Structures are given as structure tokens and as C-alpha cells.
């Protein structure tokens, strides 16, 4: 006890990692990455 600094930001475990819940601005720029090539 008596040791609580900072850091502690990564969080990814399990088979269902489903890392798609917070993107804010990402779906709008997905279409722009297709018509350019």
C-alpha cells in the first residue's frame, strides 16, 4: 500500500479485443482513403 503513481493506460486482453468503441472522427475519413488510390 501507499504507492499509486500515474501511467496505467493500456487495456487489451481476451479473445474478443473488439477495439472499436471510441474513435470520434474516423468513420468519415474512411471513405477518403479509397477514392484517392
Amino acid at each position: 500500500p501507499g504507492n499509486d503513481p500515474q501511467e496505467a493506460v493500456p487495456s487489451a486482453a481476451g479473445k474478443q479485443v473488439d477495439e472499436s468503441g471510441t474513435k470520434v472522427d474516423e468513420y468519415g475519413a474512411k471513405d477518403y482513403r479509397l477514392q484517392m488510390p
Binding site: 479473445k15 479485443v17 473488439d18 472499436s20 474513435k23 474516423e26 479509397l34 488510390p37
Partner: protein
């Protein structure tokens, strides 16, 4: 192959399905629209040249003219066309009409053969479906979207209906051909092992087998009505009928029309009447045995460095639900990085089937990326790792059976081994310990042979 070998070649599936039909139905099949299909689907020149020989000749010819037509250096290819002669089931060998073993073709098929090549008449230009004089006057790109929607609904049934709620009976139809498997703990059906390869080549040859699936019942369905209706979309576009099919139809013709429209080969107007127009996918059915298309730049490109096989990402709405149906991969934060920790996700799908040739086909032939830009072989050393995962499911076996122990002589146990082998109930034998495994299906028959010997 688990049920797709007969789909790649069209001339082989038609000859196999014709052998198991009714004699009254085959008589009506020998028509003028069917003459241009039994020859165009072929490939060898020997099997196609014999059709013109039975047209000019009016009398049956003996086998002496056939053994001489090969001169001296051609009888080797004659044996290859011997098995095909019995596939179409149209010739007939008589006794001796003018020599010895006279070969003659069915005169019912010979009459309709000249109508679609030389002679003619009137009933050919009166019936619909096979003709239907009508031109096209509708926006073509607007109707191309409906052809893709008919095939997209089938993809929802293979996964488990993620967002579809249609009333089309397509789950049980594909289950008869070994494509869809019913879920035991649940109720939405999934997919079999041979169903993964169908979602890879994307060829219209599979839709031809779906049309003849309802005819396999052989109850109150005829082939003469299906063959004359399937010839509509085989003539590419500009082949309609306006409203001629409405006047000349029945209850049986409407049933096969609704099933063909849901497959993706023909589009029908509202209220299931008025004017019908075939889709664009029907052109590739009469062109070749396969086909490609659907992209102009191919943004996808895999990696040939490590071993987890980074699959392609960012394409369209087709590859989104396609990779998850294979083995359910993973995705990270950016534009859906699929297949990055492939180690346990692949083994989850291989436990329900030996799907080993479909993953390699999807890894090698996905959009032709590496074989065009690079040069060496696409798979590195994963060809051995994939085979190791398939062998992991062979470590055990879940089967039932009975074992016979405690015999007396050694020569007496050898006679009992032939009893279960002939009936087909033997699995494994052991002559060193006198042990034999017998399935419970034939347990009531093996015990009778032991009490008599």
C-alpha cells in the same frame, strides 16, 4: 472435394443428373432448345463431331464404320469418348440393321436437332421463354444493384442472419447439397466445409445447380418446363418477352420463376408479373466455367514476411462479414486491421470441419495481389503449419462400437473378419490379440455367424 467437383464442369453434371430421371420426362426433354446445350457445354472434339454424323444418316450404321474412321492412330482417343456416349443417353445399339451392331440415335431427338440447325417450322416462334420478341428500354446500371442484393441475402443465412429478416426459404435449400449445416445447440444454420470455397471464386456455375435442386424430388415437377425457362437468361441481355409470358403460363411456371429470381440470375418487376429482365451475372454463365471482376485498383495486399498472415483490409461491405465467417479474426484501433494474432482463432473453425483447402485458396487467391507485383511463391513456410493444425483434430475419434474378446483358436478368428468386412460394419481388426470392432448398426447380424461356425 466435398461437393463442388460437379460444379466446375457443366457437361459432367448434366450427364449424371440425366441418368436418374423418369422415362416420360426424358421424352419431353429432347427438344430444340436443348440441342444447343448438350454440345456447347462440351470441350473435346470427338464427342462433339458425332452429333453431326447422326443428322445426315437416315439408316443405322454398324460399328465397322466407327472402328475404321479412326484409321490406325486414333483408337486411343476412342476409348475416352466411350464413357461419354452413355452419359447423354441418346444413342442406341441395335442387333443387325445392315451389318453388325448397328448404332442409331433416338429419332425423337433427331427431329428437334434439325430444327435448331437446318430445318424449321412454326411452334418454335410461338412459345415464349425460348423466344419472347422484346427489346430493352430501361436503365441498366440501376438494375445491376438488385443482382448483388440477391446474393447478399444468402450470405446472411450462412452467418446467422445478423440484420436480415426476409421470408425466403433459402436455408434448407442449400442444406441438401452439403453447403449449409444446421446448428445443434441452436436453430440458425451455419455452413459446412464445402461452403467456404463457394465464397471465394464467386462464379455463377453454382446457381445452375440451385435451379435443378427442386427437380431432384421427382414428384410433380418436369424438366421440359425448367429447360425452356433457363434458356432465357442464357442469351445475355436483350432477351425478354414484355407480357407474352403472362398469357401463356400456369401454376407450375410461376413456382420456378420465383425461385430463379431470388438466386440472382433474373430480375422481376413488382407484383411478380408485367415485364422481366435478366441480370448481368447471367452473361458469365454462358461465357466460361468461372470468372473474375468487381475491382479496378485492388487496394488489398497481404504480407509474406512473418507467419500470422496479415489479411487485406479496407475494400467494401463484402469482405467485412466474409472473414468473420471463415474463422472470426480480430481487429485493432485503425481501419480494421484483420488477422494479426492468428493462432487460436483458426483452430476454432477447424474443429467443425477439415477446412484446409479453403483457407489456402483464400490466402493465395483473394484479389491477385502478390502474384502480379512480386515474383516468388505467395505462401512462405506456412504450408506445413496448416497441415499440423488439421492433424490435431485426428488425435481422437468419437465413434461407437462393440468388441469381441476371449476366443479359442487363431484360424477361427480369421473367418469372422470376413463376415464384418463384406457387410460393411468392420472398422479395425487385430490378428495378434483377436479383437474386432463392430458397429452397433450390424450387431444383430455378426452374432448369428459366430453361433453357426
Amino acid at each position: 472435394s466435398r461437393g463442388l467437383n460437379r460444379v466446375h464442369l457443366q457437361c459432367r453434371n448434366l450427364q449424371e443428373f440425366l441418368g436418374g430421371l423418369s422415362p416420360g420426362v426424358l421424352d419431353r426433354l429432347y427438344g430444340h432448345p436443348a440441342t444447343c446445350l448438350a454440345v456447347f457445354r462440351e470441350l473435346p472434339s470427338l464427342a462433339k463431331n458425332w452429333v453431326m454424323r447422326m443428322l445426315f444418316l437416315e439408316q443405322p450404321l454398324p460399328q465397322a464404320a466407327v472402328a475404321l474412321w479412326v484409321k490406325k492412330e486414333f483408337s486411343k482417343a476412342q476409348e475416352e469418348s466411350t464413357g461419354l456416349l452413355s452419359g447423354l443417353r441418346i444413342w442406341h445399339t441395335q442387333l443387325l440393321p445392315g451389318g453388325l451392331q448397328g448404332l442409331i440415335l433416338n429419332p425423337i431427338f433427331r427431329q428437334n436437332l434439325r430444327i435448331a440447325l437446318l430445318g424449321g417450322g412454326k411452334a418454335w416462334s410461338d412459345d415464349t421463354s425460348q423466344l419472347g420478341p422484346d427489346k430493352h428500354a430501361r436503365d441498366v446500371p440501376s438494375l445491376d444493384k438488385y443482382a448483388e442484393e440477391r446474393w447478399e441475402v444468402v450470405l446472411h443465412f450462412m452467418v446467422g442472419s445478423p440484420s436480415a429478416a426476409v421470408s425466403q426459404d433459402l436455408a434448407q435449400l442449400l442444406s441438401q447439397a452439403g453447403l449449409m449445416k444446421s446448428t445443434e445447440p441452436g436453430e440458425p444454420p451455419c455452413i459446412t466445409s464445402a461452403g467456404f470455397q463457394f465464397l471465394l471464386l464467386d462464379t455463377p456455375a453454382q446457381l445452375w445447380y440451385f435451379m435443378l435442386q427442386y427437380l431432384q424430388t421427382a414428384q410433380s415437377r418436369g424438366m421440359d418446363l425448367v429447360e425452356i425457362l433457363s434458356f432465357l437468361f442464357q442469351l445475355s441481355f436483350s432477351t425478354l418477352g414484355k407480357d407474352y409470358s403472362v398469357e401463356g403460363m400456369s401454376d407450375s411456371l410461376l413456382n420456378f420463376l420465383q425461385h430463379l429470381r431470388e438466386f440472382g440470375l433474373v430480375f422481376q418487376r413488382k407484383r411478380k408479373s408485367r415485364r422481366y429482365y435478366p441480370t448481368r451475372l447471367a452473361i458469365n454463365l454462358s461465357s466460361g466455367v468461372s470468372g473474375a471482376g468487381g475491382t479496378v485498383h485492388q487496394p488489398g495486399f497481404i504480407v509474406v514476411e512473418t507467419n500470422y498472415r496479415l489479411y487485406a483490409y479496407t475494400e467494401s461491405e463484402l469482405q467485412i462479414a466474409l472473414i468473420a465467417l471463415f474463422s472470426e479474426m480480430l481487429y485493432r484501433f485503425p481501419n480494421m486491421v484483420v488477422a494479426q494474432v492468428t493462432r487460436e482463432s483458426v483452430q476454432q473453425a477447424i474443429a467443425s470441419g477439415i477446412t484446409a483447402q479453403q483457407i489456402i485458396h483464400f490466402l493465395r487467391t483473394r484479389a491477385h495481389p502478390v502474384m502480379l507485383k512480386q515474383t516468388p511463391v505467395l505462401p512462405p513456410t506456412i504450408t506445413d503449419q496448416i497441415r499440423l493444425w488439421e492433424l490435431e483434430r485426428d488425435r481422437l475419434r468419437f465413434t461407437e462400437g462393440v468388441l469381441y474378446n476371449q476366443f479359442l483358436s487363431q484360424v477361427d478368428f480369421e473367418l469372422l473378419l470376413a463376415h464384418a468386412r463384406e457387410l460393411g460394419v468392420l472398422v479395425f481388426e487385430n490378428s495378434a490379440k483377436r479383437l474386432m470392432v463392430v458397429t452397433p448398426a450390424g450387431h444383430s447380424d455378426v452374432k448369428r455367424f459366430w453361433k453357426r461356425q
